[PDB]
């Protein structure tokens, strides 16, 4: 039943850097068990019996605790280590987990490649208009999208979605959608996708016109 409290869920670490996660428990516990989980995948056992290291795991990982505060430590961070790590307890009943800490690969900050798309001729024929705007391959994760039509901020009707970190280059990507009526879209002229990122001292703009 014991409540398991984990350290900063959003943790950032570059290759080489040493990482430390801690799992705090509400009541005293005999041993702690850690698991790893990848983007929508079955969680695999990582560290069992407080510090034994399960089957599959590199020795750069290490467990410790032996009390009411336990910890998982990576000595040398690597790219294949980005994941969410959970801590489980076996001592009391019922069996409980932590909330999880999502480890993340810190790398050089990259600016996004922005692309905007007018509605397809199919969507208009069925009475509908969706202006998509892709923001591909950037770091860090935090970014804001600002839509503009005829030079004014469209506040509602927006729709954002994020992919997880890329296993190759460790960047993120973002799809922003703007769904309008076929009639409301066939009225304004300029459609701007204004994106703000920490890398640049100005927002990256991609716009188009219906009169094309």
């Amino acid at each position: 039943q014991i409540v398991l409290t984990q350290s900063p869920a959003l943790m950032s670490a570059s290759p080489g850097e040493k990482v430390t996660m801690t799992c705090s428990a509400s009541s005293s516990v005999s041993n702690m068990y850690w698991y790893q989980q990848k983007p929508r995948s079955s969680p695999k056992p990582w560290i069992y019996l407080t510090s034994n290291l399960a089957s599959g795991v590199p020795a750069r990982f290490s467990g410790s605790g032996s009390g009411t505060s336990y910890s998982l430590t990576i000595s040398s961070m690597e790219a294949e280590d980005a994941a969410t790590y959970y801590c489980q307890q076996w001592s009391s009943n019922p069996l409980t987990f932590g909330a999880g800490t999502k480890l993340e690969l810190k790398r050089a900050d990259a600016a996004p490649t922005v692309s905007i798309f007018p509605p397809s001729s199919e969507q208009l024929t069925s009475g509908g208009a969706s202006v998509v705007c892709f923001l591909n391959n950037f770091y860090p994760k935090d970014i804001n999208v600002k839509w503009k039509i005829d030079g004014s901020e469209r506040q509602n009707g927006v729709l954002n979605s994020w992919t997880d970190q890329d296993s190759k280059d460790s960047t993120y990507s973002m799809s922003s959608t703007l769904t309008l009526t076929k009639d409301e879209y066939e009225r304004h002229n300029s459609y701007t996708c204004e994106a703000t990122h920490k890398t640049s001292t100005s927002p990256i703009v991609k716009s188009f016109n219906r009169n094309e």
Binding site: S42, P43, G100, S115, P119, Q123, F134, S161, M174
Partner: protein
């Protein structure tokens, strides 16, 4: 080799029941204990109970005492979990896991993938697939809007375009899911050759291929 295989994703109306199955193979069924875990999409893990075949011994997480029933076939080496009186907050991904019977020096060494139960009154809905062409490196994409059951499948040229692809997670615009996918290819590649995104929504068995064409 040890393998645990679970039933496919499900969509049930609130109130009814569902029977999730975990099929073991490659090891003696009556030597390991099967646990069940719930992970509401996004949130963390939660234990529901265990089942030991042979003794037929059960022990539910006492939150899910009235929610779940653990049975087993044993002739097929298969553990069952039934959920009854389903509501909206039962929508989650359910795992099964294996642990040795008399060890203590063991762990949950093998898991059997997820099963994404969806509890909703929404009707099963095929998707609308729209191509997205622009107007040195050329980004394309297609929009998949207005489908419900989940999930969908997006490839480009039957999987002949793998790298440089970004398929984005779905979101509910109103009470239907919308998904977007992108591919980036050299200017020499397109529009001089065909690009066709392939969408498959298995819950409705639709299978759609949309050629990306430049505009007039």
């Amino acid at each position: 080799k040890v393998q645990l295989q679970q039933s496919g994703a499900e969509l049930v109306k609130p109130g009814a029941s569902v029977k999730l199955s975990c099929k073991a193979s490659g090891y003696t069924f009556t030597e390991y204990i099967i646990h069940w875990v719930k992970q509401k999409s996004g949130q963390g893990l939660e234990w529901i109970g265990w089942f030991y075949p042979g003794s037929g011994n059960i022990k539910y997480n006492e939150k899910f005492k009235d929610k779940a029933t653990l049975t087993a076939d044993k002739s097929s080496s298969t553990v069952y979990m039934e959920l009854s009186r389903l509501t909206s907050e039962d929508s989650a991904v359910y795992f099964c896991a294996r642990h040795e019977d008399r060890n203590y020096y063991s762990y949950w060494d093998y898991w059997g993938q997820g099963t994404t139960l969806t509890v909703s009154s929404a009707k099963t809905t095929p998707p609308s697939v729209y191509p997205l062409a622009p107007g040195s490196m050329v980004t394309l994409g297609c929009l998949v809007k207005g489908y419900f059951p989940e999930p969908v499948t997006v490839t480009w040229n039957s999987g002949s375009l793998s790298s440089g692809v970004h398929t984005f997670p779905a979101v509910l615009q109103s009470d239907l899911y919308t998904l977007s996918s992108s591919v980036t290819v050299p200017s020499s590649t397109w529009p001089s050759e065909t690009v066709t995104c392939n969408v498959a929504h298995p819950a409705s068995s639709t299978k759609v291929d949309k050629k990306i064409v430049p505009r007039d």
